[PDB]
Structures are given as structure tokens and as C-alpha cells.
From a paper:
In this paper we describe a novel filamentous double-stranded (ds) DNA virus that infects a host living in nearly boiling acid, and show how components of the virion (proteins and lipids) can diverge considerably while preserving the overall virion organization and mode of the dsDNA packaging. The results revealed that the two most prominent bands contained proteins VP4 and VP5, with apparent molecular masses of about 16 and 23 kDa, which are encoded by ORF23 and ORF24, respectively. Surprisingly, VP4 and VP5 assemble to form a pseudo-symmetric heterodimer, which wraps around the DNA, in a manner similar to the symmetrical capsid homodimer in SIRV2 and the pseudo-symmetrical heterodimer in AFV1.
By trial-and-error, the correct symmetry (which was 17.14 units/turn) revealed a largely α-helical protein capsid, while incorrect symmetry values gave rise to density that was uninterpretable. The three-dimensional reconstruction showed a total diameter of ~270 Å, and that the nucleocapsid within the outer membrane had a helical pitch of ~47 Å. This means that there are 1440 bp in 127 turns (120 local right-handed turns and seven right-handed superhelical turns), so the DNA has a twist of 11.3 bp/turn. An interesting difference between SFV1 and both SIRV2 and AFV1 is that the protein subunits contain N-terminal portions that project into the DNA groove. In VP4 no density exists for the first three residues, but two or three residues at the N-terminus can be seen partially inserting into the DNA.
Residue numbers in the entry:
A (entry chain a), B (entry chain c), C (entry chain e): 4 to 134
D (entry chain E), E (entry chain C): 1 to 194
Amino acid sequence: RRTGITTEDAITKYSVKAKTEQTAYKNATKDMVVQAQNIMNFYSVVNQALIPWLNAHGVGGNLRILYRQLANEYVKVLNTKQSGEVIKRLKIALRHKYWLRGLDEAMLDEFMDYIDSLKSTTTNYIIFNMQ
Amino acid sequence: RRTGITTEDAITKYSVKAKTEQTAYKNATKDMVVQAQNIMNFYSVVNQALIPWLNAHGVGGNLRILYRQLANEYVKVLNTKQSGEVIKRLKIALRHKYWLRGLDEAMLDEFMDYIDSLKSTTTNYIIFNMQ
Amino acid sequence: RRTGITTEDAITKYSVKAKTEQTAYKNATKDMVVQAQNIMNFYSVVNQALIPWLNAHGVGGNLRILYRQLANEYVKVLNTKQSGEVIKRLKIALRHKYWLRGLDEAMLDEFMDYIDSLKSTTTNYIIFNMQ
Amino acid sequence: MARKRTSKNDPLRMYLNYVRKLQTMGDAYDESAKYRIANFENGFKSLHMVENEFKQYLANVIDEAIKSGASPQDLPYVNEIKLALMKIFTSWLKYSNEKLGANEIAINVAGTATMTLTENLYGTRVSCEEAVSLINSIFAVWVGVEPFEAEEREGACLVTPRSPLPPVPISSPTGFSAPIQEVLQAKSPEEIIG
Amino acid sequence: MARKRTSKNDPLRMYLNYVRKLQTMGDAYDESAKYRIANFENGFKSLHMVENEFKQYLANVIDEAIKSGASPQDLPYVNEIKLALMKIFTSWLKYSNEKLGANEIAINVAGTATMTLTENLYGTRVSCEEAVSLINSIFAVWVGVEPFEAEEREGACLVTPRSPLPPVPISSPTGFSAPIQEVLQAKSPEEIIG
């Protein structure tokens, strides 16, 4: 396929596919039931490592989300299968980015030293089983 | 058959064959079910050889695709049944082509030395079985 | 029958026979099912002898077809039941013809020495069986 | 159409895709009839005109050779040798029917000349040099070129071109020819079109 | 389309989502027909025009080379070498069919030139320098640039650009072309539109 496509062609696709995309979402519910426990695995392995750190290092209520933004982006980079040779660069990239959004670096050096216990989350939960 | 054919004849074929080509796609779904696991074999044998190299040699997130462009074109040339006497020429052809799209040759010499562990992928998955 | 026939008579035949020729093609499908595996025999016995030669003698991707033009015309001359006393003439005829279409003779002498392992392909696959 | 993605040389996939699409070929042919008939209607005229022009100009060249005092046993050209010369001229019709250049037509017709004059003039009283002189005379009548130089250098005869060759002076039209009864029984021009 | 959230490299999820959506692809194709046909209607003309323009300008350049006294055995360009040159010009059609800049077109066509002139001119009588001179002559006919410098520096041939390349002088229109019978049999313009 190309790239360069007009504004009308994409709108024409999205408008005419409405019936098929909703009758495909109706089957994607059946598929989502068994695959949805990656949510449970994700928040288990993130809260089990961040609730003691945030809770005992002294950060407040509503800044915990900004720290979750940092940790969640790091876990996304992890479970797209990317090991330490890219992580040693994306750690200082994320450090500068969330310093730029108003955090304090006396928290950030300790937090970037802390996030090496977060790992990959998502697995597969549908086996083939031809029998 | 010839080659030289007018613009109207090809459009006349494609416009009048719509009913038969869609009722042939409806049977090609049944054929695609068992043949579609060449996708699984392909990405298994490509990721198993490229995820450690890309992951430990230090390349980023969004350049991994350009490296996949190189490796995927090499695997296509492989599984059209073409062994080393053409590969010893297409390696330097692909080296110049993806150098021309902005890569670095200090990556390319090591990567062209690396891609000899990629091999053919596609097999057949429908047996005849007259009984 | 004669030969010399007007332009209108042939067009009159082809235009009026449309119903009978399409209802004969509808039965020729049933006949084609069992006879179509001469395609399989043909490409098996041609690829099994040409893929190592083309693949290890160094010829490229898109010239393999021109070599297939030569080999396929030789296999047609074979399986119209024509043995060596005509082949010793048609080999040098085909050598001059595909030299004239831009090949190199340092490939052609070795290739004409190579094509004596190609033989006839087509068999019959419908037995009578009066019982 | 072909899969247009990769070769994937495997004969069993070939036969199995053929068996899969035999349940659609039988209807696509019935659908294809409606333009099949008109394209043959205005495509067969080129073949029939080039075959009549070959018959006529071969007869003229042979009669001008007989008027020079030769015998009709010297130059047979009866049934199969005329079929050979019609093979080379019909391949000239094909490579002119595409929009090919002049020398590409010349060398493809030279290759077909090599194959044809290799096959069917061993054992039949007619040397290759006389046949190639006859072909050059017919092209001198048609377009006035005389392009082919030949040799009997090996056991077969080999034809190579000397000059580029023009395409056939016959245009294949994109008409939609209607009967005279449809013209006379109609009431309006748009009834003939529509 | 893709999931657009994360990569999640796992082949079994790929095959399983494909098997899940095979019960909807077979109806989405039937729905897609109604704009598929019109987009091909006004998209195939660009291919057919650029292939005819290649045939014509290659014929002109080859005939001007023959008028300089060369032989038609010196420069074959018959079936597959023309197919190589059509590969590079059709990739030029693609990268011009997007709204890309000049040098981006130049280096993508140079990469396709590298791959094509690497593959199919080993073992066939035509050096790479003559082919690249021919490509530069055809671009001198079309847009008058002559962009590519080449080398046979290794066992393959390598093409690199010297100057930016303009896009193809052919516009792909967004028409809705109606038959002449629909024009004549109608009673109003809004019956043709509506």
C-alpha cells in the first residue's frame, strides 16, 4: 500500500465500515474476556513495587499519578521486548522529560535508581489445542 | 496472451468481475485459515534472531523497523528459493540501498555479517489425501 | 474442409456458438480436475533440475524467467514426442535465438550442455474401466 | 491474476489453488462472454488481412520469378513451406500488435525465423538461402526494407537482422459494429447506442 | 488497523487474531467494493500512461542510437531488460504518487535502481554503465535532469543520485466518470448526479 491518500478516502472508509466494525467488536468481547487479566497482572506488578516506595518516601496524594506516568511508560518500553542497552538511554530521557514537567531531581535520581525492579507484564491466555 | 492492451479493457475486466471475485474471496477465507500460520512461522524465526541483536547492540525504538525492512527483504529473497551465489551480491546491494536511506555503516558491516542465520519460512499446510 | 474462408463466416461461427461453447466449458471443468496435475508434474520436474543450476551458477532474480523460456520451450519440444535426431538441431537453434535476445554465450554453452536431463512430462489420468 | 507477492516454488500449492478456483472459473467465463465477443469481432480482421496479403504478395513474387524462365518444379512452396512463411509473418503481426520499437520487432521476428527455418526445411529440396531471399523479397514488397541476413553455418539455419523493421501497416480498431437491420429498424440514434 | 497500543511481539496472538477476524473480512470486502471500483477506475490510468510513455521514449532513444550507425545486435533490450527499466520507472511513479519531496524521490528511485540493476544484468551482455546512461537519457527526455551516477565498484552495480528528481508529470484525478448512455438517457443533470 501507499501512504499519500486524500481526506475523502479515509472518511469514506470509516463511514462505510460501521456495520462490520461493530459486528466485529461484538466478537471482540468474547476475545477480551480471557485476555483482560493482563490488566490484573499489570497493576499487581506495578502496585507491588510502587506502593511502598511512594508510600514511605513521602510523596503526596495527587502527584502519585505523575510518578505512575513515569513508571507506566517505562513498563510499556519493557514489555515491548526492549532490554538494557536501550533502557540506559531512555532512563535519562524520561528523567529530563519528567523533570521538565515540574518534578524535583532529588526525587528523580533515587527513583531512576529504583526502577529496575519493574519488568514485563503481558502474556498470552489463549492456547490452540486442535483436539 | 499479448501484452499491449488498452486502458478500457483492463477497467472493463475489473469492473465486470466484481461478483465472481468476491464470491471467490469468500472461499479463499476457508483456504486462508490453515495457510495463515506462515505468519506465525515467519515472525517466530525473524524475532528469535533479531530481538537479541537489536536489543543488545543499542538501536532505538523506531529504527528497529528500518532494520526489519532490511531483514524482511532478505528473508523474501531467501524463501523464493535463492541460495548463496545470488546472496553474495544482494547483500552488498541491500547494504548500499539502506546506507542510502540514512543508516550508519558501522552498524551495517556487523549487521550484514549477522544475517546469515535467517533462512526460509513458508511451507505448505494442505495435504491431498484421496481417501 | 477447405482453407479459404471469408472474414464474416468465422465471426459468424464464433458469435453464434457462445451458448454451446460455455456449456461445454462447464463440463470441461470436471475434465480439468483430474488432468490438471500435469502442471504439478511439469513444475516438479523442471524446478528439480533448474533451481540448483540457476541458484549455484550465479544468475540473478529476473533473468531466471528468460532461462525458463529456454527450458520450457525445450520441454515442449520433448513432450511432443521428439527424440535426439531433432534435438541436435533445435539446441543450436534455441542457442542462437536466446543469444539474440541478449544473453551471454559463456552461460549458453554450459546451459545447452546442461539441458539433457529435462524429459517429457505429460501423462494421461483418466482410465476407461467399462465395469 | 497471480499471487504477486513471492514466487514460493511449490507444485502442490499450484494444483491445489487450481482445484480451489475451478468452482469460480465456470461462471467467470459466462460473465466474460459479453466483451469476449466484441474484442474478437474487431481482432480477427488483422489476422485475416495479413494472411490474405501474404497469399497475394507471395503469388506476385512467385509469378515474377516464373516469368524469368524458371520451372514450376524448381520452386514448390505448396502447403507446409507456405505455412512456415505464414508462421514468421504472423509472429510479425504479434510483435507489431504490441507497441514495440522497430529493432525489437526485428530481432523477435529474426528469432521466430531461426526456429521456423530450422525446423521445417531439412529434407525438403529447398535450401535456406533461397527461403531467406524470398522473405526479403516479401518485406521489400510490404515495407521495402529487406532486413534479414542468414547463414547455414551449422546444421540448422540461423537468421540475424541487419536493419530495424517497421510494424504492420494495419490498425486494429476499437469499434462496436452494429447490424444494418438495427440501423434501419431503429427510430433514433440513441436507440442504436443505448 | 493495528492494535496501536504496544508491539507485544508474540506470533500466536497474531495468528489467533487473524483466525478471529476471518469471520468479518468476508463481508468487509463485499462492502468495500463500492469505492474499490471507482478508485481503481481513476488509478489505473497513471500506470498505463507511464508504461506507454516509457515504451515510446525508449523506442525514440534506441532509434536515435541506431541512426548513429550501431547494430541491432549491440543493444538488445528485448523482454527482461525493458522489464528492469520499467521496474525503476514504476517505483518512480509510486514515490511521485505520494506527496514526497524531490530528493526523497531521487534517493528512493536510486535504491530501486541499485536493487534492479544488481539483480538482472549479471550474465546478459549489457554492462551497468550503458544501462545507467540509458536511464539518464530517458530522464533527459522526460524532465531533463540526468540525476544518477553509477559504479561497478563491487560485484554488484551501485546507483547514487547527483541531483534532486521532480515527480511524474501525470495527475491522478478524483473523477466519477459516467457512461455516455447515462448522459443521453437522463432527463436532468441531477439525475446523473443523484
